[PDB]
Amino acid sequence: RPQSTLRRAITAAYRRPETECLPPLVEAATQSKEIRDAAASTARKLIEALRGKGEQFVTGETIREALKRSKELEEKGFSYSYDMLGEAATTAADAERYYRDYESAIHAIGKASAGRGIYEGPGISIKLSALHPRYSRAQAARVMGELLPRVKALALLAKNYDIGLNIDAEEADRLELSLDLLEVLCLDGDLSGWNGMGFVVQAYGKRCPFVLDFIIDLARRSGRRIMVRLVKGAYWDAEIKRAQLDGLADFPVFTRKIHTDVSYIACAAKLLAATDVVFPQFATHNAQTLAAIYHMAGKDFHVGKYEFQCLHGMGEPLYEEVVGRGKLDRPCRIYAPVGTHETLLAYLVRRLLENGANSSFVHRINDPKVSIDELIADPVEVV
């Protein structure tokens, strides 16, 4: 079977015991004392800068409005990825509506990009659940045969304007389908010459390093430089609840928060060693995570090597201390939702759980009981 070894490794990791997943990640995430000392200084600076000085999550109601509101931050060195809000389509008519939303957005974003390309100019992010009715329930063969022509058509428009098109990561049980779709698109000759295809991998998932191995190898055999957004993950609370009801003895996600942090750093090390064939995009609002990757990546940098990413309404204060020659001189792409209350609910719940959780960096930075010492501590050394 093609890629038998890489695919078997993903499947074997799906619900592997958490204690067995961690040792290789801890080793891969271990950095030198010299690097850890330098990163602690950077993280302290970022946090000292930070601790001083629903509509909040949405950039605009239409793509035209969102694009207009993006000019100020683009002038400062930020880029954008626009998300037409909407997911989990329940009818064919809803899936067709979302498809048309994305199509119209690509034309508008492509015009605004004006030839800036996939790294300096804006792109789009899509959710597969918006494009197939009952995405979570229908057999993969039926989902594939109807979804693939739709995603290909959107990818062709993005190619035509030379903008990025990212497939967002959703629930753990749709990782396999989405990855199979990524493979088919990356091997499709009609998309040749365009490196804008992107894909998210969630470091809270046990399969993350093995999915990355598959994607890096896919980049090598397809000739596409795949954009890879490394995230921790947005669905943790729902995944725990679903696994409990499913009767599982071992879950598809980690259950200790610092294990996700270690997983993220280990996976960043793998991505940073493969920048010839992937474009790593480090999505995080955690200043300690950011500092660790900034130092892991070393002194040599150019635009197009890698970037950081943040969510609209959450990451701007931190990344104002990152973008720009006087700061860390590293770019950041803002994930920019577009829509109204009618399409905001699912995304907003995930933001509430992210912002309100006692374990989240964005909560802890405002917690008087959490010292700066603890905020800059390297989680890898805790394990």
Ligand X SMILES: Cc1cc2nc3c(=O)[nH]c(=O)nc-3n(C[C@H](O)[C@H](O)[C@H](O)COP(=O)(O)OP(=O)(O)OC[C@H]3O[C@@H](n4cnc5c(N)ncnc54)[C@H](O)[C@@H]3O)c2cc1C
CA distances from 295 to 34, 35, 271, 321 (A): 10, 6, 14, 15
**260 labelled binding-site residue:** no
| Cα 66 to Cα 121, 172, 178, 196, 207, distances in angstroms | 14, 30, 28, 21, 35
The annotation status of 257 as a binding-site residue, yes or no, is: yes
Tell whether 361 is in a known binding site.
yes
Per CB under 6 A, which region of 50-58, 198-206, 298-306, 339-347 contacts ligand X?
A: 198-206
Smallest distance, a second copy to C-beta of residue 249, A: 13
Q: How far apart are CB 340 and a second copy at their closest, in Å? A: 8
For the record, the structure tokens of 147 come out as 């979804």
Residues in touch with a second copy (CB under 8 A) = 54, 90, 137, 237, 244-245, 340-342, 344-345, 348-349, 352-353, 356-358, 363, 367
Q: According to the binding rule CB under 6 A, does residue 257 interact with ligand X?
A: yes
Decide whether 141 or 249 has the Cβ nearer to ligand X: 249
Stretch that binds ligand X, among 28-36, 93-101, 230-238, 370-378 (CB under 6 A): 230-238
Interface with ligand X includes 87 (CB under 6 A)? no
DSSP letter assigned to residue 132: S
Residue type (1 letter), 76: K
For ligand X, which is the closer residue by CB, 64 or 257? 257
Task: State the Cα–Cα distance between residues 354 and 286, nearest whole angstrom.
Answer: 12
According to the annotation, is 31 in a ligand binding site? no
Tokens of 267: 């996976």
The listed partner (ligand X, a second copy, none) that binds 54, CB under 5 to 8 Å by sort, is a second copy
Q: Which of 183, 202, 186, 204 is nearest to 194 (CA)?
A: 186
Looking at the Cβ atoms of 37 and 237, the one nearer to ligand X is 237
192 is in an annotated binding site: no
C-beta separation of 105 from 63 below 8 A: yes
Taking the complex as a whole, the smallest distance from the CB of residue 237 to a second copy amounts, in Å, to: 7
Strand segments, DSSP code E, in 90-137 are: 123-126
H or E element, residue 202:
strand 197-202
Q: What minimum distance in Å lies between the beta carbon of 209 and ligand X?
A: 15
Q: Which does 345 bind (CB under 5 to 8 A by kind): ligand X, a second copy, none?
A: a second copy
Among 42, 129, 222, 260, binds ligand X (CB under 6 A): 260
Return d(Cα 296, Cα 29) in angstroms, integer. Answer: 10
| Of 224 and 350, CB closest to ligand X | 350
Stretch that binds ligand X, among 13-21, 35-43, 267-275, 277-285 (CB under 6 A): 277-285
x/- mask, ligand X, residues 305-344, rule CB under 6 A, reads ----xxx-----------------------x---------
Q: Are strands 197-202 and 226-231 parallel, antiparallel or unpaired?
A: parallel
299 annotated to a ligand binding site: no
For the chain, the distance separating the N- and C-terminal CA atoms, rounded to the nearest angstrom, is 37
**Cβ distance to ligand X smaller for residue 210 or 236:** 236
**Cα–Cα distance, 168 to 339 (Å, whole number):** 17
**Residue 318 near which of a second copy, ligand X, none (CB within 5-8 Å, type-dependent):** none
DSSP string, 13-46: HTT--HHHHHHHHHHHH---HHHHHHHHHHHHHH
Helix (H, G, I), strand (E, B) or coil at 124: strand
- The partner in contact with residue 348, picked from a second copy, ligand X, none with C-beta cut-offs of 5 to 8 angstroms by kind, is a second copy
CA–CA separation, 246 and 239 (whole Å): 10
Please give the Cα distance from 239 to 180 (Å, whole number). 22
Can you tell me the distance from the alpha carbon of 310 to that of 335, in angstroms, rounded to the nearest whole number? 6
Torsion 142-143-146-149 (CA) sign: negative
The CB-of-148 to a second copy minimum distance in angstroms stands at 24
Q: How far is CA 344 from the centre of its chain?
A: 19
In the annotated binding site for FAD, the residues are: 169, 202, 229, 232-234, 236, 255, 257, 284-286, 351, 354, 359, 361
In the annotated binding site, the residues are: 169, 202, 229, 232-234, 236, 255, 257, 284-286, 351, 354, 359, 361
Q: Which residues bind ligand X (CB under 6 A)?
A: 168-169, 200, 202, 204, 229, 231-236, 254-257, 259-260, 283-286, 289, 309-311, 335, 354, 359-361
